């Protein structure tokens, strides 16, 4: 493993996401329709942190990330996913297809700066110890070249309900210094069946630098209206929560809005504090005199004790292990301590 | 299996890419409980699922009733929570002759106290001392300072409600993805241009099958109309696109 330190330490740079980050949200074919879907999408015009030099620190992974690279000599190698990424938790390793396209969810002991090296490959310095393999998948062998732009590669990495979902798109590009304006959707590439807790990630690169840069954005729950063309290709989209015109477009289920007045949503002031007020009673309720009683009544002549003017702490009675039945009607047994009678 | 998991730390085996013959499991006489939610137990062999999870643990006889949607109790709340929209079958059988020991088998543990209820299919395998009161415990047991786990004392002389039961929960997931687990159904020849009753990898209806001119992408298995009803299917054996 090699720790790359010959890095200028500058704050993150930012660029404009424009209309990037749209992927096919589902596996159903539709055409000549506008479909509204609520999912994790990259927001339009979202600010996107921009990395190059040898730029690759550890980044947060929140709901999911958008990854895109603009490269001329295929420097990106893969991604590291995990929680600690130091064999304390399960981790995911995706190597380049040069050896093989491979996702190994084995338990690896990783380096504090994993990478692959190259122009020919020699070093493999990604991890040291590796045992407790639980999942493996290997794609048919290929090869990732180890040595304005022309080739654009887009990736979306999600970890939802037991699936690690990878989406990708291959397109022509023509910007020197930015993400293009125009539209493309990322088709799903492979569905990985791994029920993994992913919160942190690191980028693998292949000392000298190649011509490459990469971008990381973050996904949020948003509603998008997607336009499917005659061939079932997604050709446009509106992020309806970006601004009121996109909101109007989402409400009217159309990308064209006529002159007029539209009722599109409802504004609401949100509460900022939680105000809880209960009486100044401190005496405890006399439940103990009935539950630990030594002289229970007969059922034909059952006893009744009335309990009043006291504080009823039900976490002691509910959290007791000594009762075999605790069935509640009209109230739930686990919310009982928040009520007054 | 000979090494079932504890309920506080239950095992999960994922089953995929196979033919699931449920007439052997359903028609077995060896199970005492086979209650299904979301599906019927006698039509299970005609269905296809994306993937099936088989969760397994040992619980107390009186506690078999808690392994169901909408239940409360120490196990349902702190060990294994099943969701209310669960699709699957809960299988349990008496295992006193395997899991019980004369002096008592204490290798089966359950969580007794927890700060909050579990979410569906959440696991908690920590051994943090449970805080019952307001005074910090600093890692020490005592009153209001409790150890969260406890064992079931399984003995051959216990009553039926206190005997060990082995429970296997089969969770059936239905999401828009390739199906990998299907019942033991035989396939017939494909018929086009005729009024037929079809079952395409679980998609059922009545209609006439014709050749489609839709350009499906390699990952799309079926289509829907503006009405969001099925109107196109990719055949599961030959990767041909049909309009329905």
């Amino acid at each position: 493993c090699v720790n790359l330190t010959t890095r200028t330490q500058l704050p993150p740079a930012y660029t404009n996401s424009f209309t990037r980050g749209v992927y096919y949200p589902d596996k159903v074919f539709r055409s000549s329709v506008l479909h509204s879907t609520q999912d994790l999408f990259l927001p339009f015009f979202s600010n996107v942190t921009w990395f190059h030099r040898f730029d690759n620190p550890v980044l947060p992974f929140n709901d999911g990330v958008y990854f895109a690279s603009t490269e001329k000599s295929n420097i990106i190698r893969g991604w590291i996913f995990g929680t600690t990424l130091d064999s304390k938790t399960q981790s995911l390793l995706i190597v380049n297809n040069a050896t093989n396209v491979v996702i190994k969810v084995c338990e690896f002991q990783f380096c504090n700066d994993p990478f692959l090296g190259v122009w020919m490959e020699s070093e493999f310095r990604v991890y040291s110890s590796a045992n407790n393999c639980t999942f493996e998948y290997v794609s048919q062998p290929f090869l990732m070249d180890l040595e304005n732009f022309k080739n654009l590669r887009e990736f979306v990495f999600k970890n939802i309900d037991g699936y690690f979902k990878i989406y990708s798109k291959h397109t022509p590009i023509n910007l020197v210094r930015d993400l293009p304006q125009g539209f493309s959707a990322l088709e799903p590439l492979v569905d990985l069946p791994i029920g993994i807790n992913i919160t942190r990630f690191q980028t693998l690169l292949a000392w000298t630098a190649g011509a490459a840069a990469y971008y990381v954005g973050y996904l949020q729950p948003r509603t998008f209206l997607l336009k499917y063309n005659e061939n079932g290709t997604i050709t446009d989209a509106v992020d309806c929560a970006l601004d009121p015109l996109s909101e109007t477009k989402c409400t009217l289920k159309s990308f064209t809005v006529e002159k007029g007045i539209y009722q599109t949503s409802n504004f609401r002031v949100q509460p900022t504090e939680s105000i809880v007020r209960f009486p100044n009673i401190t005496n405890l309720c006399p439940f103990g005199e009935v539950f630990n009683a030594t002289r229970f009544a007969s059922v034909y002549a059952w006893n009744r004790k009335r309990i009043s003017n006291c504080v009823a702490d039900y976490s002691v009675l509910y959290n007791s292990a000594s009762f075999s039945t605790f069935k509640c009607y009209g109230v739930s047994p686990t919310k009982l301590n928040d009520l007054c009678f | 299996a000979t090494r079932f998991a504890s309920v506080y730390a239950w095992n999960r085996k994922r089953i995929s890419n196979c033919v699931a013959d449920y007439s052997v499991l359903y028609n077995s006489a060896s199970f005492s409980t086979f209650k299904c939610y979301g599906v019927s137990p006698t039509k299970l062999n005609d269905l296809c699922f994306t993937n099936v999870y088989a969760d397994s643990f040992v619980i107390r006889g009186d506690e078999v009733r808690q392994i169901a949607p909408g239940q409360t109790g120490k196990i349902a709340d702190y060990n294994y929570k099943l969701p209310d929209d669960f699709t699957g079958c809960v299988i349990a059988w008496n295992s006193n002759n395997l899991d019980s020991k004369v002096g008592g088998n204490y290798n089966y543990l359950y969580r007794l106290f927890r700060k909050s209820n579990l979410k569906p299919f959440e696991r908690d395998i920590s051994t943090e001392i449970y805080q019952a009161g307001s005074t910090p415990c600093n890692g020490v047991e005592g009153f209001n300072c409790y150890f969260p786990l406890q064992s079931y004392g399984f003995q051959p002389t216990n009553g039926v409600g206190y005997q060990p039961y082995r429970v296997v929960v089969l969770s059936f997931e239905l999401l828009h993805a390739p199906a990998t687990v299907c019942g033991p159904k035989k396939s017939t020849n494909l018929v086009k241009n005729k009024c037929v009753n079809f079952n395409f990898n679980g998609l059922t209806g009545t209609g006439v099958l014709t050749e489609s001119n839709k350009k499906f992408l390699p990952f799309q298995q079926f289509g829907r109309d503006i009405a969001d009803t099925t109107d196109a299917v990719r055949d599961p054996q030959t990767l041909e696109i049909l309009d329905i």
Partner: antibody
Amino acid sequence: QVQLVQSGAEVKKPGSSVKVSCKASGGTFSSYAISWVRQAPGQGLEWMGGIIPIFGTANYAQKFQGRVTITADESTSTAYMELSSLRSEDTAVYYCARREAYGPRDYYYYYGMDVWGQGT
Amino acid sequence: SALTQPPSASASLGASVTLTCTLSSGYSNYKVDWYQQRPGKGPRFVMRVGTGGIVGSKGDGIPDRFSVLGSGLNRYLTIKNIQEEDESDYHCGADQGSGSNFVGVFGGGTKLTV
């Protein structure tokens, strides 16, 4: 304060039956995990059984199951043991031992054996 | 083997004597106790260690110097600043519960000749 004392030492011919008491003075009796233990002369301690008086159930070791009878008399706040079919190896000092109880009392949350008997 | 405990050890005055009472795989998640037996007298409780921590005790005729730690499947009793009062037989036991007390498998014991 709380202490457990039993009867004196008995000597019996082999093949007879021996009954050993255990008196309890102080504290809230019938919540204690009353236990019976023994140690051979020059050998480590060996368990034989235990009893919780409130539950009225008695547990025994496999070596002594079917040969040791243990009962707890809640009225006198005492715990009794009956051991039959004594052999040559069975001679040893016999101890009556208790455990503090805390928690739900139906599930094992107990302190150590802080208090012991004087021997038998 | 159940509770495995060394027959005898010998430590010098003012030193550290770590005593290992190992827990078997079948008897892994059991409470562990520690007792001090003077020669010819009844054993008395020293400290109790659980799988999650220390049970906690005081005022049982035990010097403050005594301490117990539990790591993994091995339970360690540590004696610091030992003098001639500590020469005795120490026993560690197992335990279990949920309404029937189960049994305590007592180890062989340790004869710490100072």
